Curated annotation (Swiss-Prot):
The gene is CCL23. This is CCL23(22-99). The lineage of its organism: Eukaryota, Metazoa, Chordata, Craniata, Vertebrata. Disulfide bonds join C11-C35, C12-C51, C22-C62. It comes from Homo sapiens.
Amino acid sequence: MDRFHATSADCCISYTPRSIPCSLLESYFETNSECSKPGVIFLTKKGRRFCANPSDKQVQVCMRMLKLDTRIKTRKN
């Protein structure tokens, strides 16, 4: 990690080390695959988003919730 320019990074350089629940989030997206170190970014309802590993069980359990498919299409929001 040789980032010596301001503090505005683009790829994932730190994953929130906390078992945050999906209900405590609003949406999420994937970083650019062009980034050597890609990852998932979860956005909270406090305008705060961080990086997250796709290997976390809480991450896959939250994606199935924010996903537009969910499972059998139940409600909307």
